[PDB]
């Protein structure tokens, strides 16, 4: 359909870019981070993106947990 768990790789960017996390797409897409990993993201994962950005560590963190409503409304 259009849900995040159905995103492959490049479809995860659409989200990231929306929260200014486009900076993470460069690595998110590299490790094939899909909605599967998007939804359950934690600091360890965000750190494993090698970016470890302070803003993002809090921002993506908020966005990823509310993805359940945000995936739809974009």
Strand content: under 5%
CATH superfamily: Transcription Factor, Ets-1
Q: Number of folding domains? A: 1
The total beta strand count reads 0
By secondary-structure content and strand pairing, the structural class works out as mainly alpha
Inertia-based shape: globular
- Please outline the major beta sheet: none
* CATH architecture label name: Orthogonal Bundle
Q: What's the gyration radius in Å?
A: 11 Å
CATH topology grouping: DNA polymerase, domain 1
Distance between the termini: 14 Å
Number of helices: 6
Q: What proportion of the residues is helical, as a percent range?
A: 55-70%
Order of helices and strands: HHHHHH
Q: According to CATH, what is the class?
A: Mainly Alpha
What does this structure look like?
There is one protein chain. With 74 residues, this protein is mostly helical. The protein has one domain: Transcription Factor, Ets-1 (DNA polymerase, domain 1), CATH 1.10.150. The chain is 55% helix and 0% strand. This is Neurabin-1. It is found in: Cytoplasm, Cytoskeleton; Synapse, Synaptosome.
